[PDB]
Design a protein around this ligand. Structure first.
Ligand SMILES: *C(=O)[C@](NC(=O)[C@H](C(=O)O)c1ccsc1)(OC)[C@@H]1N[C@@H](C(=O)O)C(C)(C)S1
Ligand SMILES: *C(=O)[C@](NC(=O)[C@H](C(=O)O)c1ccsc1)(OC)[C@@H]1N[C@@H](C(=O)O)C(C)(C)S1
Lengths: 260, 263
């Protein structure tokens, strides 16, 4: 059932669809191009925020640390940071801005805190993710060039990591709860995975988009009366200038939710 | 007269299978674009803005009001309580209930705001106090969402709601602290990305409140900060002839796109 339906959706879309579900009720999975690399775009901000949360487990006041926001720091999408130019934001405020508003200046401050993109990758390796790689800062990490492994992961790897971060023990108890709180407060997600799910289900997610019409969402889902799901939906298209297709992610989620 | 924008909205409506209401205020020149601007629509969850604003108004003469605890009982839970259900047999403050009502559209939270205002008529009284003669709240959650065609209960017009949202968020209907809090809450909405937001350029900032109900009723009210220009207020209301009709957030996105293209 599910494989035929996801293949049909992909064919209709004209693009390349990646799906990984983990149903924590029974540890069953639904994979479609689960081992192909896709450009993460803004979904990478989850790994950067989680890496700073892990640092805060041993640097106990780190999330309170002021960070200078200079005019020269502003990049291409700064809905929160532009308010604080020529002042400071804390690492907690930058983490919330990066996750809930997808602020690219905030993401660059998280990356800088970790010593550069390699510090985000190092955290991925530390929690057993051998697939994830962050190579570039914002905004060049979103070029989404076909065949380019930079700033990519696989749906399988990202679903497994998102499970460990939000439902497992990659982070300390307080830090896991803080990541889940941030994801549940996302502002950008209503057109993506959660548009394909019953309204009664609770979703925390991080969206992204980029060149090649790249349209992404990674979610942790609490269905009414049953154990949580983790769902990654990645999508990218042949034309550099392609339009976003959040409806394709919604459709993938709806197929997944039918099929259990 | 019918403008280019009104003709495009008419063509969208004709293809939609329902009835579309739009009101734009461009605060660059205070001009209005209306489509069925003086027709009534069921507000559904967009009514939560007036309830939260009424409690913010109360807080202007009670510095501690937003810290006041409210008991959440098992009997209080209604049909959509993602925040309140975590606090059953405990308390939430009026700030927590305001944030839950606006940013998660918690119906139990809305009922606590309504009760703090003395019932639905307390919300209407606040609307009258800030110059809105059109708004009416008649019922609590969840019955205020029945959205029956021709029913005046729990309705407003696009024109009235755009003017009210402007006065609340950009004007002086609230104190400056309270106006800033309302804008912060709306900008942190979780439910908006498929609605007005989906029709606007990505660089534009939005705070909004969505709603849906029966008759495929699909609503959004937004304050918009365009890249390089004064803010807009936009109301998009949509309702359909059949009780069981599907939501059409795409129609609100399409209306917003026509408005943005027409500026
Ligand atoms: C993350 O994906 C996001 N967008 C980008 O990274 C893109 C970029 O090149 O910087 C971008 C696409 C359109 S405008 C900028 O980071 C700013 C945010 N996530 C997108 C999404 O969820 O679809 C937004 C909300 C369009 S911006
Ligand atoms: C407000 O509109 C909202 N939903 C309702 O009021 C509806 C009801 O009958 O209580 C409802 C429709 C589907 S489930 C409950 O209040 C809970 C929220 N706003 C809707 C929207 O924005 O489309 C939600 C997010 C579906 S729930």
């Amino acid at each position: 059932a599910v494989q035929q339906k996801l293949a049909a959706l992909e064919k209709s879309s004209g693009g390349r669809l990646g799906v990984a579900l983990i149903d924590t009720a029974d540890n069953t999975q639904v994979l479609y191009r689960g081992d192909e690399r896709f450009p993460m775009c803004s979904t990478s901000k989850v790994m950067a925020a989680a890496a700073v949360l892990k640092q805060s487990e041993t640097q106990k006041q780190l999330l309170n640390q002021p960070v200078e926001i200079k005019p020269a720091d502003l990049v291409n999408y700064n809905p929160i940071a532009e308010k604080h130019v020529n002042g400071t934001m804390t690492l907690a405020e930058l983490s919330a801005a990066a996750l809930q508003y997808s602020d690219n200046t905030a993401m660059n401050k998280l990356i800088a805190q970790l010593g550069g993109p390699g510090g985000v990758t190092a955290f991925a390796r530390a929690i057993g993710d051998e697939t994830f790689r962050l190579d570039r800062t914002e905004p060049t990490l979103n070029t989404a060039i076909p065949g380019d492994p930079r700033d990519t992961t696989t749906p399988r790897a990202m679903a497994q990591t998102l499970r460990q971060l939000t439902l497992g023990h990659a982070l300390g108890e307080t830090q896991r709860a803080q990541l889940v709180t941030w994801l549940k407060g996302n502002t950008t997600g209503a057109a993506s995975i959660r548009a394909g799910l019953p309204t009664s289900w609770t979703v925390g997610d991080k969206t992204g988009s980029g060149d090649y019409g790249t349209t992404n969402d990674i979610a942790v889902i609490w269905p009414q009366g049953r154990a949580p799901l983790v769902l990654v939906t990645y999508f990218t298209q042949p034309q550099q200038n392609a339009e976003s297709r959040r409806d394709v992610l919604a459709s993938a989620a709806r197929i997944i939710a039918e099929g259990l």
